Structures are given as C-alpha cells and as structure tokens.
C-alpha cells in the first residue's frame, strides 16, 4: 500500500494577508490557507519504522526558513536596513496528491524505530519556525514523561534533544547601555524540571551521576542562548540555568545577562552581516522553553559519570524537534 518517499510538500497557514509581518507576508504566497476540519485517520493494525534523523521534511522546512531570513531581514552590509514586524507564525507542511503523512502516537517514542499507534494526518500541526540555540522555544510539548531524542547516544558526537513534558517560561526584555537586555525565568520551577531531567537521563545513563556545565567553547551563538525577539538578536549567558547545587537549598528567581547584537554569524549562507541600531522602545518576548539541546562530554567513558553542556546551532535539529513523529510516504 505504500513505500517511503520524499516530495516537495506544500505549506499551509493561517497567515493574514495584509498584516505586514515577515512570516505572514512570506506565507500569503508560497503557502495555502488552512483547513478548518483536517482529519486524522487511525490506521488498522499498523506499525511503521520511523526515523526523525533521516526525514526530508526537515530539509524542506530548513530551506524554507532560509528563503525567509535573507529577504525579510535585509543585512546592514548597505543594501538598506528597512526594519519590519517579526513574530513567527505556525506553518503546517502537507502532502500533495498521492502521498500521505504517517503520524506517530507513542507519547514516549524516541523518533526512531517502530511505532504501532500510527495514524494518517493530512498535515503537521502548526509549527513555528523559531530559530534558536541551547533552548527550543515556544514549540510543542512531550505528552507523557520527558523524551531524550538522539541519533545514537553512545556517540558523544551527537546532539541531544530533550522534549520537556512541562513548560516553564522565559520573559526576555530590553528597556528604553542601548544594548543591555535580560531574560527572566522562575528558578523554583525551572530547577524542578531539569532535576526531573537528570532523573530521566539517569534512566538512559546507567544511574550514572549527571552534571551540567557551560559550553566548553565555540562561537557565541552556541555558547549562549541566541534567539530572535521582534527582529533583534539576543545572546544570553545561561550559566545560571545549568547550575547544579541550586536544585539542596538554593534560591527563587533567575535573571540572565543577554546582550542585543548588531554584528553576528550567519546561518543561512556562510559569512557575516551587521544590522542597524535597534528601536529604543521596549522589547519583550515571553517564551516557553519546550525543550533543550545539549551535547555530552562523554570523552571519559567511564569516569563514573557523564557530563552535558548546552548546544544547538544545527537548526535542522530545531525542526527534527517537532517533525520527529511525522514521515512521508507514497501510495499506489
């Protein structure tokens, strides 16, 4: 009845024509409107072999969000720095005639191997193309416990996506040092999750003891929490987030440094490019850390324990974080 296949999908959105936002104005063309009554079909007695790490849907999402950045986020070298509205909208990816999408419903399913509660969806849920490092922001959420995605965990070389089962917030601001900013998180709450994490990593790590530390070294973007708020790139120090000890007898809130930045490293092409002075109004993106991205030192083996430092940077992974339970297939 089917064989795996890749094919240029089509994209669907609630993008409102007129509103001058980037993601809207890019979706109102290239994307089609949204169905109000889409339908999920639970397939028969069915199990399918998924694999979130070799999924062509994430390479189409990937080239999508690129044709968005350099085109509606013009660089200050200057081609001219028009500044305009920027809040990602949810995009659905869909199948053209004669191909289907197989969704997975195993709640605690690492996006690889066999699934069993397979349904047929016409489109993927509303996914926002939210580019960041370290943390995965205002995304979806794991449905039961927490799930530890990775392509082969025994390889310290592989990025590790955790999908939180509980969502805790990040209030990220700058006032009206024209670049000082700061990100506000309720530590009470956020320490219980990472604790809850560690707990879930010990499952995957022979009850070995689990520690957290800043990234060992890299470009700022992946050494810090780089993200986009209304068109300004933030770079937050996170050291206060993977603080062990605080987890004992500790403290309440947390505040993060974060410095807005005009000069930055590209992730569309290869190179660099500056951006104008920001707006001296205020900026405040309240976001939901739905999942975090790390790398394992592992390097010892052994050493009695395992180390984990924040990561990200492969944005392909930001997508595989929400397109893991999908897979495309050809019919007749």
């Amino acid at each position: 009845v089917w064989k795996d296949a890749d094919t240029t999908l089509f994209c669907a959105s609630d993008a409102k024509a007129h509103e001058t936002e980037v993601h809207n104005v890019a979706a109102t063309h290239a994307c089609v409107p949204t169905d109000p009554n889409p339908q999920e079909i639970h397939l028969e007695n069915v199990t399918e072999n998924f694999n979130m790490w070799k999924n062509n849907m994430v390479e189409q999402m990937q080239e999508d969000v690129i044709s968005l950045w350099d085109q509606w986020l013009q660089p200050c070298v200057k081609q001219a720095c028009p500044k305009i509205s920027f809040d990602p909208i949810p995009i659905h990816y869909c199948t053209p005639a004669g191909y289907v999408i197989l969704k997975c419903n195993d709640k605690n399913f690492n996006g690889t191997g066999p699934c069993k509660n397979v349904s047929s969806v016409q489109c993927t849920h509303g996914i926002k193309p939210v580019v960041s490092t370290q943390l995965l922001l205002n995304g979806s959420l794991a449905e039961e416990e927490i799930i530890i995605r990775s392509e082969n965990l025994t390889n310290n070389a592989k990025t590790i996506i955790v999908h939180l089962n509980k969502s805790v917030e990040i209030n990220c601001t700058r006032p009206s040092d024209i670049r000082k900013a700061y990100c506000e998180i309720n530590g009470t709450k956020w320490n219980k999750v990472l604790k809850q994490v560690t707990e879930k990593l010990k499952e995957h790590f022979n009850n070995k003891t689990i520690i957290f530390q800043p990234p060992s070294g890299g470009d700022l973007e992946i050494t810090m929490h780089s993200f986009n708020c209304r068109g300004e790139f933030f770079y937050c120090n996170t050291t206060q987030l993977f603080n062990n000890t605080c987890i004992k007898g500790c403290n309440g809130t947390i505040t993060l440094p974060c410095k807005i930045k005009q000069i930055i490293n590209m992730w569309q092409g290869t190179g660099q490019a500056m951006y104008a002075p920001p707006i001296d109004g205020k900026i405040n993106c309240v976001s939901n850390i739905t999942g975090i991205l790390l790398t394992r030192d592992g390097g010892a083996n052994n050493t009695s324990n395992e180390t984990f430092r924040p990561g990200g940077g492969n944005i392909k992974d930001n997508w595989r974080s929400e397109l893991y339970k999908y897979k495309v297939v050809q019919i007749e």
Binding site: T133, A157, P215, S216, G217, G218, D219, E221, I222, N265, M266, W267, Q268, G269, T270, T295, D297, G299, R309, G311, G312, G313, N314, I315, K316
Partner: peptide
C-alpha cells in the same frame, strides 16, 4: 561552518573543533 578553520581555532585552547551547522564549536 568552515571546519578546518574551526579546528585550528579551538586548538588555541586545546579543544577539538566541530561544526554546529554554520557555527564553530569546541570540545
């Protein structure tokens, strides 16, 4: 990402270099 540059670059502090997409990482 420019790997060989990134490798050389992290080697300053005695770390190995890996691409994180278009970014350079050190471990």
């Amino acid at each position: 990402x420019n790997l060989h540059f990134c490798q050389l670059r992290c080697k300053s502090l005695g770390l190995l270099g890996r691409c994180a997409x278009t970014y350079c990482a050190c471990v």
